[PDB]
Swiss-Prot record, chain A:
NMDA is probably regulated by C-terminal phosphorylation of an isoform of GRIN1 by PKC. Its phosphorylated state is influenced by the formation of the NMDAR-PPP2CB complex and the NMDAR channel activity. It comes from Homo sapiens (Human). It is linked to Neurodevelopmental disorder with or without hyperkinetic movements and seizures, autosomal dominant: An autosomal dominant neurodevelopmental disorder characterized by severe intellectual disability and developmental delay, absent speech, muscular hypotonia, dyskinesia, and hyperkinetic movements. Cortical blindness, cerebral atrophy, and seizures are present in some patients. Belongs to the glutamate-gated ion channel (TC 1.A.10.1) family. NR1/GRIN1 subfamily. Residues 151-284 are extracellular. The gene is GRIN1. Component of N-methyl-D-aspartate (NMDA) receptors (NMDARs) that function as heterotetrameric, ligand-gated cation channels with high calcium permeability and voltage-dependent block by Mg(2+). NMDARs participate in synaptic plasticity for learning and memory formation by contributing to the long-term potentiation (LTP). Channel activation requires binding of the neurotransmitter L-glutamate to the GluN2 subunit, glycine or D-serine binding to the GluN1 subunit, plus membrane depolarization to eliminate channel inhibition by Mg(2+). It is found in: Cell membrane; Postsynaptic cell membrane; Postsynaptic density membrane; Synaptic cell membrane. Glycine binds at P120, T122, R127, S176, D220. Disulfide bonds join C27-C61, C43-C62. Heterotetramer; the NMDAR subunits are modular and harbor tiered domains that function in concert to regulate opening and closing of the cation-selective ion channel pore. Forms heterotetrameric channels composed of two GluN1/zeta subunits (GRIN1), and two identical GluN2/epsilon subunits (GRIN2A, GRIN2B, GRIN2C or GRIN2D) or GluN3 subunits (GRIN3A or GRIN3B) (in vitro). Can also form heterotetrameric channels that contain at least two GluN1 subunits and at least two different GluN2 subunits (or a combination of one GluN2 and one GluN3 subunits) (in vitro). This is Glutamate receptor ionotropic, NMDA 1. A hydrophobic region that gives rise to the prediction of a transmembrane span does not cross the membrane, but is part of a discontinuously helical region that dips into the membrane and is probably part of the pore and of the selectivity filter. The extracellular N-terminal domain (NTD) is a site of allosteric regulation to modulate overall receptor function. Glycans are attached at N47, N78, N162, N259. The chain holds residues 394 to 796 of 938 of the full protein.
Curated annotation (Swiss-Prot), chain B:
Residues 138-278 are extracellular. The gene is GRIN2A. Changing L9Q: In FESD; uncertain significance. This is Glutamate receptor ionotropic, NMDA 2A. It is linked to Epilepsy, focal, with speech disorder and with or without impaired intellectual development: An autosomal dominant, highly variable neurologic disorder. Features range from severe early-onset seizures associated with delayed psychomotor development, persistent speech difficulties, and intellectual disability to a more benign entity characterized by childhood onset of mild or asymptomatic seizures associated with transient speech difficulties followed by remission of seizures in adolescence and normal psychomotor development. Rare genetic variations in GRIN2A may be associated with susceptibility to schizophrenia, a severe psychiatric disorder characterized by hallucinations, delusions, disorganized speech and behavior, cognitive impairment, and social withdrawal. Component of N-methyl-D-aspartate (NMDA) receptors (NMDARs) that function as heterotetrameric, ligand-gated cation channels with high calcium permeability and voltage-dependent block by Mg(2+). NMDARs participate in synaptic plasticity for learning and memory formation by contributing to the slow phase of excitatory postsynaptic current, long-term synaptic potentiation, and learning. Belongs to the glutamate-gated ion channel (TC 1.A.10.1) family. NR2A/GRIN2A subfamily. Coiled coil: none annotated.
Length: 284, 278
C-alpha cells in the first residue's frame, strides 16, 4: 500500500556524497559556500563493499548535485520517495550469464527494486534499449586522470594505443566506459589491456592513481575535472573523447517520464541547473 | 507508411540550400522542395525543386538508411524554427504539430514549451545561448549588468538577437527588462547581425551557441568571438521533432546514440563544424 518512489543512486562525488549518519540516526548540519544549508537525505545501503560478501543494509547520509536534483524533481512533480544505494555498487552493463542479465542500477531498475535511477548515469544505446532516459541534465565526456608529471596527448597516445605491462591504465568494472571500449572494435587492443586492471568503483581507481598502483584512469570528465581541481597531485590529460550525457533512468512504462524531462528542460532554461554546477562543481 | 514527409529550414552549416543542377541533385545533396508564391495577391504557388546538404542533412541520410524509411523533404515557408503566436504554432514546430510533417530536421532547439506539443529525439548537437562580441569586449556573460541593467551605462551597451526563436523566448522568460530593451536591436538574421557587429553598429549579438561557435571559428581575421571559452547559457541541444507518441522516436533515438558511439557523429563535426579560429 505504498505509492512512494524507490530511488536508486550510487556514491560518486560531486553528484552523490555518502557519509555515515550521526549516533542518533540523523545527518550532520552543513552549509554551502553561499551560507545555504546543505540538503541531505537518508540513503540505506551496504557497509561491506567487498565482492561475494553478505550485504548488511545500514542508513547513511546522501547529498550532492543529484540529491538537489531529486528534491527539485520531487517538489515539482509532487511525489514522495525513498533513497537506497545500489546493492552491488555498480552503474550497470548487460552481461552473458545463453541468457543476458543487467547488473548494477540498471539491474535494480528493471527488476522493480528501484522505480527511478537518480545518478550520473550515462545515456547510451545499450541502456536506452531497455530503459527510458530523461533529456540530459548534464553534458560531459571522457578524459584521463594521471598523477602530475605523467605526459599523454589523449586517447591517440602510443602508451595507450599500443599497451604494455609498463603503463597500466583502467576504468570502472560494469560501467558505460567499460561498454564503450567493448562495443568499439577500433579500441579492442585498449579494452583487452583494461579488462585485466579495472576497479570496482571510481573512488578506488582514483586512490590507485595516488598510491602509484594505476598510471591512467579513463572516466567521466564531470567527475575527473572535479577531482583534479580538489587533489592538486592529480591532473586530467588530453581533451574530451566520446562526449556523453547523464540522464534520469525510468522503466519504459513509467507515468513520470514526460514530466521528468519537462522538469529537466525547465531547470536548464531558468538557471537552476547552472546553480547546481556552481554549488557542486565550479569551485577551486 | 515508410515514405515520410519531413520539414527543414536553411541555417548553415546544419542545413544549406542550393539551386538544382543544369537537371537533378548531385553528390552529397538531397532533393528538397520550397513552395514559392506566384504573387502576394494570391494563394497560388509552385514547389521549386532545390537541393539540400549540411550536417543535419547528413544525419537525415544516415537515419533514412539505418531506421529504413524514405522521405519527401520540404522547406518551411510559414515561420522559421517555431513560435507560438496566440497559442498557434508556426515554423518547423507548427508543421509537426498540425501533421504536415512526420518530423522536423534542422537546427531546432529542444525547449520545454516546444516539448509540450512535439516529441524530441535525444539532443544530437550541443547548443544553448552564447554572446558574440568583437575580441576584447568586456562582458562576463548574459548575467552582466551591461545586459541586465543597460541604462546604468553611458552610452548604453547595444545588443540584440534574431527574434521569434528559442533565444528570445528564453530572454523573455528570464530577463524581462533586458528583453524589452533589446527589441530595438532585433536583427533580421545572423548575417545582418555579424555585419552590424563588424561595422560598430552593435556591441553584442546573443544567439544559438552552435551557430555562433561555427561563425566565430570561420570569421575573416578572427575578430568576432564568443564570450568565455565560447561559454553556453541555458545549455540544450538540437533535436529532431516528431509528433507526440510517434512510432519513429525509439528507432531514431537508438540510431543517434549508435552514431555517437560508432564515431559517425565526430566525423560529421569534423566535416561541417570545425574552424580555423581558436
Ligand atoms: N544524450 C545524448 C547525446 C549523444 C549526446 C549529446 C551530443 C552528441 F554530440 F553526442 F550527439 S550533443 C549533446 N548535448 C547535450 C546538451 N544538452 N541537451 C540538453 C537538452 F536536450 F535537454 F536540451 C541538455 C543538455 Cl546538457 C547533451 C547530450 O547528451 N549531447
Ligand atoms: N535554433 C533556434 C533558432 C536560433 C535562436 O533563436 O537561438 C531555435 O530552434 O529557435
Amino acid at each position: 500500500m505504498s505509492t512512494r518512489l524507490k530511488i536508486v543512486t550510487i556514491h560518486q562525488e560531486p553528484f552523490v556524497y555518502v557519509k555515515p549518519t550521526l549516533s542518533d540516526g540523523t545527518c550532520k548540519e552543513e552549509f554551502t559556500v553561499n551560507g545555504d544549508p546543505v540538503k541531505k537525505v537518508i540513503c540505506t545501503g551496504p557497509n561491506d563493499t567487498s565482492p561475494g560478501s553478505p550485504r548488511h543494509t545500514v542508513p547513511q547520509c546522501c547529498y550532492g548535485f543529484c540529491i538537489d536534483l531529486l528534491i527539485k524533481l520531487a517538489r515539482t512533480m509532487n511525489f514522495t520517495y525513498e533513497v537506497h544505494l545500489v546493492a552491488d555498487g555498480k552503474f550497470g552493463t548487460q552481461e552473458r550469464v545463453n541468457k543476458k542479465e543487467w547488473n548494477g542500477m540498471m539491474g535494480e531498475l528493471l527488476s522493480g527494486q528501484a522505480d527511478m535511477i537518480v545518478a550520473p548515469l550515462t545515456i547510451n544505446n545499450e541502456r536506452a534499449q531497455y530503459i527510458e532516459f530523461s533529456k540530459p541534465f548534464k553534458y560531459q565526456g571522457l578524459t584521463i586522470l594521471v598523477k602530475k608529471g605523467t605526459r599523454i596527448t589523449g586517447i591517440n597516445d602510443p602508451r595507450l594505443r599500443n599497451p604494455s605491462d609498463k603503463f597500466i591504465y583502467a576504468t570502472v568494472k560494469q560501467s558505460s566506459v567499460d561498454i564503450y571500449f567493448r562495443r568499439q572494435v577500433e579500441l579492442s587492443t585498449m579494452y583487452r589491456h583494461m579488462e585485466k586492471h579495472n576497479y570496482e568503483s571510481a573512488a578506488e581507481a582514483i586512490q590507485a592513481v595516488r598510491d602509484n598502483k594505476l598510471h591512467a584512469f579513463i572516466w567521466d570528465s564531470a567527475v575527473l575535472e572535479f577531482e583534479a581541481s580538489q587533489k592538486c597531485d592529480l591532473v586530467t590529460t588530453g581533451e574530451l573523447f566520446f562526449r556523453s550525457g547523464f540522464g534520469i533512468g525510468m522503466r519504459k512504462d513509467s507515468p513520470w517520464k514526460q514530466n521528468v524531462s519537462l522538469s529537466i528542460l525547465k531547470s536548464h532554461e531558468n538557471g537552476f541547473m547552472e546553480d547546481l554546477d556552481k554549488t557542486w562543481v565550479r569551485y577551486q | 507508411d515508410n515514405h515520410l514527409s519531413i520539414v527543414t529550414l536553411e541555417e548553415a552549416p546544419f542545413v544549406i540550400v542550393e539551386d538544382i543542377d543544369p537537371e537533378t541533385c548531385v553528390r552529397n545533396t538531397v532533393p528538397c522542395r520550397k513552395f514559392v508564391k506566384i504573387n502576394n495577391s494570391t494563394n497560388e504557388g509552385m514547389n521549386v525543386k532545390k537541393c539540400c546538404k549540411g550536417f543535419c542533412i547528413d544525419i537525415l541520410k544516415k537515419l533514412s538508411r539505418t531506421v529504413k524509411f524514405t522521405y519527401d523533404l520540404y522547406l518551411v515557408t510559414n515561420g522559421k524554427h517555431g513560435k507560438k503566436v496566440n497559442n498557434v504554432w508556426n515554423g518547423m514546430i507548427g508543421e509537426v504539430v498540425y501533421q504536415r510533417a512526420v518530423m522536423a530536421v534542422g537546427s531546432l532547439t529542444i525547449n520545454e514549451e516546444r516539448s509540450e506539443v512535439v516529441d524530441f529525439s535525444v539532443p544530437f548537437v550541443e547548443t544553448g545561448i552564447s554572446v558574440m562580441v568583437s575580441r576584447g569586449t568586456q562582458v562576463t556573460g548574459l548575467s552582466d549588468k551591461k545586459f541586465q541593467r543597460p541604462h546604468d551605462y553611458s552610452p548604453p551597451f547595444r545588443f540584440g538577437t534574431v527574434p521569434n526563436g528559442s533565444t528570445e523566448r528564453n530572454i523573455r522568460n528570464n530577463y524581462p527588462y533586458m528583453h524589452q530593451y533589446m527589441t530595438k536591436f532585433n536583427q533580421k538574421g545572423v548575417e545582418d547581425a555579424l555585419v552590424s557587429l563588424k561595422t560598430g553598429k552593435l556591441d553584442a549579438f546573443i544567439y544559438d551557441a552552435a551557430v555562433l561557435n561555427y561563425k566565430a571559428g570561420r570569421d575573416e581575421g578572427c575578430k568576432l568571438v564568443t564570450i568565455g571559452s565560447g561559454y553556453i547559457f541555458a545549455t540544450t541541444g538540437y533535436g529532431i521533432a516528431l509528433q507526440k507518441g510517434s512510432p519513429w522516436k525509439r528507432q531514431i533515438d537508438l540510431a543517434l546514440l549508435q552514431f555517437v558511439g560508432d564515431g559517425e557523429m565526430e566525423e560529421l563535426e569534423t566535416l561541417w563544424l570545425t574552424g580555423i579560429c581558436h
